[PDB]
C-alpha cells in the first residue's frame, strides 16, 4: 500500500491514494472544536463554540468568525495559524473581484478561487497543504441564502446544513434526520435547530459565554455577529 | 530537498548510464516500424497495436507523421512523448525555410532534433525521452534517404531497419533477403509483407493491423502516399499465393 516517498510528499501510492492530504484532514481535528452552519428559507446561521481556558486571556480576541467582505462571513476550523492565513487571502481575492469586475463577488465564485489555490498545494511536491477548513455563508440575488464548504483537498460543494470539526459525523447524522422531515424554517427555528445540534452532540446545555453566532438574512444582508445579550434571548426561549 | 532527488544524469560505477538504457529497454516493446529502399521510392511499414472494434480510424495515419513537404517519420515508444517531438522538428524545418528559402536536407534535420534529445541525457535533472523513430525523405544532394534515431541522441543512415518487438529477428532476415540497388518499389512491398508476416505473432495478416506509406519522387511533388485498405489485402494474398506454391514444390 506504500512504495517510495509516498508517505512523505504528495505523490501517488500504488493503490491510487495519496496520503499527505488524508493526513491533513485529521489535522483539523486537533483543534478540539466543532462548528455548525444551517441554511434557512430566508436566512443563514453559523454557530460555533469558543473555549477560553484562562482568566488571564482577553476573550474578545478568540473569534473564529471572520468578516470577509461586507456581506460575506465565514467560520474557521483546524489549526489557528493556517486558518488566519487563509482568511487573509479571501479578503484579498474579494477586493480584486470588485476592482476588476465592478460588482460584488458571489459566494460560490469566492469558494472556487480558494479551492483552486488549495489545489496547488497538493499538486506540487514541495508545499504543505494548509490543514484547516472553510465554511462560507452569504445572500445571493435570485438564489437566496447559500452555504459552502472548502476543504484542504481543493473540493467544495454547496450544502443545506453543515458540520465541521471533531464531532462532524455525529452532528450531520442529527441534522439529516432533522431536514428530511421537511419542516418549514423561519429565522428563529434555524437559530434553534443549530444550537440544539451541538448541544445534543456535545451534551453541554451551556450559558451564553461559550458560543458565538453570525447570521445573514434577506432584510439586513450585512454579516453581523450577535451580542451575548441577544444570544441569551434565544437561549432562554430554547428552554421552554 | 536533496533527499528526494533521483539523479537521472549521473554515471554508474561500471561506466555506463542507467537511465537511457531503461528507456531503450522500453523501446523494444510496444510497437513495430520498418523501412526499406533500393531504388526510386522509399516506404514505411508500421503495425497497428490497438485493434479494438470501437475506434473511428481517422487523422489519415496512426504512427506516420508528415514533417516537411517532402519527408515524413514513423515513431515508436511512448506516444505522448512522441507528440512533443513531432511538432518540434516540424518547425525546425520551417525556420530553416524562413532563413534560406529552400527545403531542408533530410540529414541535418535529424541532427538538429538529436541534439535536443541528447541534452536531456546530459544535464538538467530531467527525464529523457523514451522515443526512437525513423526518417524517410528526399533531397537534391543524395536522393532517397533513410535514417534512424535513438533515445541516447545518436543517429545513423541505413537501408532497411526495424525497431519492433522482434526487431532482431527482422534485421536477421533483412540481411538474408536483400539486393543493393535492385529492389524496386514492388519487390520491396512484397518483402515488406514478408517481414511483418514473421514478426507479428497475430497470424494471417489482418489488413487493418498494418499501415504502409510510400514516398515517391514525382517531378516537383515528392508524393507521400498512405495507401488505403483496399490495396493492402490484395498485396497480402499475393504473398499467400506464392508461399503455398513454394512450399508444395519443395
Amino acid at each position: 500500500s506504500s512504495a517510495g516517498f509516498d508517505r512523505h510528499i504528495t505523490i501517488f501510492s500504488p493503490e491510487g491514494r495519496l496520503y499527505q492530504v488524508e493526513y491533513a484532514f485529521k489535522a483539523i481535528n486537533q483543534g478540539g472544536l466543532t462548528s455548525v452552519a444551517v441554511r434557512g428559507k430566508d436566512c443563514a446561521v453559523i454557530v460555533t463554540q469558543k473555549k477560553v481556558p484562562d482568566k488571564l486571556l482577553d476573550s474578545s480576541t478568540v473569534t473564529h468568525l471572520f468578516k470577509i467582505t461586507e456581506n460575506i462571513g465565514c467560520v474557521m476550523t483546524g489549526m489557528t495559524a493556517d486558518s488566519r492565513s487563509q482568511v487573509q487571502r479571501a479578503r484579498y481575492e474579494a477586493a480584486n473581484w470588485k476592482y476588476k469586475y465592478g460588482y460584488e463577488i458571489p459566494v460560490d465564485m469566492l469558494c472556487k478561487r480558494i479551492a483552486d489555490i488549495s489545489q496547488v498545494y497538493t499538486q506540487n511536491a514541495e508545499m504543505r497543504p494548509l490543514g484547516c477548513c472553510m465554511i462560507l455563508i452569504g445572500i445571493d440575488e435570485e438564489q437566496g441564502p447559500q452555504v459552502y464548504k472548502c476543504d484542504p483537498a481543493g473540493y467544495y460543494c454547496g450544502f443545506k446544513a453543515t458540520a465541521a470539526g471533531v464531532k462532524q459525523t455525529e452532528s450531520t447524522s442529527f441534522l439529516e434526520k432533522k431536514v428530511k422531515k421537511k419542516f418549514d424554517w423561519t429565522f428563529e427555528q434555524t437559530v434553534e435547530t443549530a444550537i440544539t445540534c451541538l448541544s445534543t452532540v456535545l451534551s453541554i446545555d451551556f450559558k451564553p459565554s461559550e458560543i458565538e453566532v453570525g447570521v445573514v438574512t434577506v432584510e439586513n444582508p450585512k454579516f453581523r455577529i450577535l451580542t451575548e445579550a441577544e444570544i441569551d434571548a434565544h437561549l432562554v426561549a430554547l428552554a421552554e | 530537498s536533496r533527499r528526494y532527488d533521483s539523479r537521472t544524469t549521473i554515471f554508474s560505477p561500471e561506466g555506463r548510464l542507467y537511465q537511457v538504457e531503461y528507456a531503450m529497454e522500453a523501446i523494444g516493446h510496444a510497437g513495430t516500424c520498418l523501412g526499406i529502399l533500393a531504388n526510386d521510392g522509399v516506404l514505411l511499414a508500421a503495425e497497428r497495436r490497438n485493434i479494438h472494434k470501437l475506434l473511428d480510424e481517422v487523422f489519415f495515419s496512426e504512427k506516420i507523421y508528415k514533417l516537411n513537404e517532402d519527408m515524413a517519420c514513423s515513431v515508436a515508444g511512448i506516444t505522448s512523448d512522441a507528440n512533443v517531438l513531432t511538432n518540434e522538428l516540424r518547425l525546425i524545418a520551417q525556420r530553416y525555410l524562413l532563413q534560406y528559402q529552400e527545403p531542408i536536407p533530410c540529414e541535418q534535420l535529424v541532427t538538429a532534433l538529436c541534439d535536443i534529445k541528447q541534452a536531456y541525457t546530459q544535464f538538467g535533472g530531467k527525464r529523457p525521452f523514451g522515443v526512437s523513430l525513423l526518417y524517410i525523405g528526399w533531397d537534391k544532394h543524395y536522393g532517397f534517404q533513410l535514417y534512424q534515431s535513438d533515445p541516447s541522441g545518436n543517429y545513423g543512415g541505413w537501408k532497411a531497419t526495424c525497431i519492433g518487438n522482434n526487431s532482431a529477428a527482422a534485421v536477421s532476415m533483412l540481411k538474408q533477403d536483400y539486393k543493393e540497388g535492385e529492389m524496386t518499389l514492388k519487390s520491396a512491398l512484397a518483402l515488406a509483407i514478408k517481414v511483418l508476416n514473421k514478426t507479428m505473432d497475430v497470424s494471417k495478416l489482418s489488413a487493418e493491423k498494418v499501415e504502409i506509406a510510400t514516398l515517391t519522387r514525382e517531378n516537383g511533388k515528392t508524393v507521400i502516399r498512405v495507401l488505403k485498405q483496399k490495396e493492402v489485402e490484395q498485396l497480402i494474398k499475393k504473398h499467400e499465393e506464392e508461399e503455398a506454391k513454394a512450399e508444395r514444390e519443395k
Binding site: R7, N29, Q30, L56, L57, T80, D82, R84, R128, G131 | -
Partner: protein, 240 residues
C-alpha cells in the same frame, strides 16, 4: 521515523514536528513576563548573569520596535533580533504609506504572517522564538499580544514565556490588573519573578524592566533606576 525531518510533511496522525521541536527550544530561555495595568503595559525580564566578564547592560532581551511599541523576546537570540528587524521595518512602511502610527491588532497580524510563512517549506526552518508585544495609545488604551513560533497570536491580560511558564502565570492571576495603575504594578512585576528560579540553578541574576503608558506619555522606555531600586528593595521581603 523520517516523518519529522522537513516542515513540509505531516505526520501519520497529522501534525508537524519541526514546529513542535522549535517550540521546545523556547523553554531553555529563561523567563519573560509582561502584564498590562489599567492604563499601560509593564514588561519584566530576569536576566541570567552567565559569567562575571560580561558587562551590565549587555545583550538585552527587551527590544524597542516603534516609538510606542515594545518587544520582550524569549528563544534563540539571533532569531529574536531578526524578527525585531522586520517588525521595526514593518511599522516604517505603515507610517510612510498611511501617515499615522500602526495599531497593534495590525502590527501583530503582519508579523505573525511572516512567522507562519516559514512553517510551510523545506527550504527554511521555523523560528525558535516566542515574544510579546505591548503598547499604549490614547485612542485605544493598552494592548498586549504574544506570538508563538507557529504563528498564533492572542490578546492577554498578562502572559509569561520562558522556562517556568505555568509556575509564573500561577501567581499572575493572584493580582488584579484591571484596576491597578502602572506604578504599584512595577513592584508586583518584580516580586513574582523573585519567587521563581531557585538559587541552586543560578548563582546571581539581573532584573530588567520596561514600561509604557500615558504616565510615560505614550512613548516606550525603560524604567528609571530609582523605581526599580524600590522593586529591588521589595525583593527580600518574600522570605516571610
Amino acid at each position: 521515523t523520517g516523518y519529522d525531518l522537513s516542515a513540509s510533511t505531516f505526520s501519520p496522525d497529522g501534525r508537524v514536528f519541526q514546529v513542535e521541536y522549535a517550540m521546545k527550544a523556547v523553554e531553555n530561555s529563561s523567563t519573560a513576563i509582561g502584564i498590562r495595568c489599567k492604563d499601560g503595559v509593564v514588561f519584566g525580564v530576569e536576566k541570567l548573569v552567565l559569567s562575571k566578564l560580561y558587562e551590565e547592560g549587555s545583550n538585552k532581551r527587551l527590544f524597542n520596535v516603534d516609538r510606542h511599541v515594545g518587544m520582550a523576546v524569549a528563544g534563540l537570540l539571533a532569531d529574536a533580533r531578526s524578527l525585531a528587524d522586520i517588525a521595526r521595518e514593518e511599522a516604517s512602511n505603515f507610517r510612510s504609506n498611511f501617515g499615522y502610527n500602526i495599531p497593534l491588532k495590525h502590527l501583530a497580524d503582519r508579523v505573525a504572517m511572516y512567522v507562519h510563512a516559514y512553517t510551510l517549506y523545506s527550504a527554511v526552518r521555523p523560528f525558535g522564538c516566542s515574544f510579546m508585544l505591548g503598547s499604549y495609545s490614547v485612542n485605544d488604551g493598552a494592548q498586549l499580544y504574544m506570538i508563538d513560533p507557529s504563528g498564533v497570536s492572542y490578546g492577554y491580560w498578562g502572559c509569561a514565556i520562558g522556562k517556568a511558564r505555568q509556575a509564573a502565570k500561577t501567581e499572575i492571576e493572584k493580582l488584579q490588573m484591571k484596576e491597578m495603575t502602572c506604578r504599584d504594578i512595577v513592584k508586583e512585576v518584580a516580586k513574582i519573578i523573585y519567587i521563581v528560579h531557585d538559587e541552586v540553578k543560578d548563582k546571581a541574576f539581573e532584573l530588567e524592566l520596561s514600561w509604557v503608558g500615558e504616565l510615560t506619555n505614550g512613548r516606550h522606555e525603560i524604567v528609571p533606576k530609582d523605581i526599580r531600586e524600590e522593586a529591588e528593595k521589595y525583593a527580600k521581603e518574600s522570605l516571610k
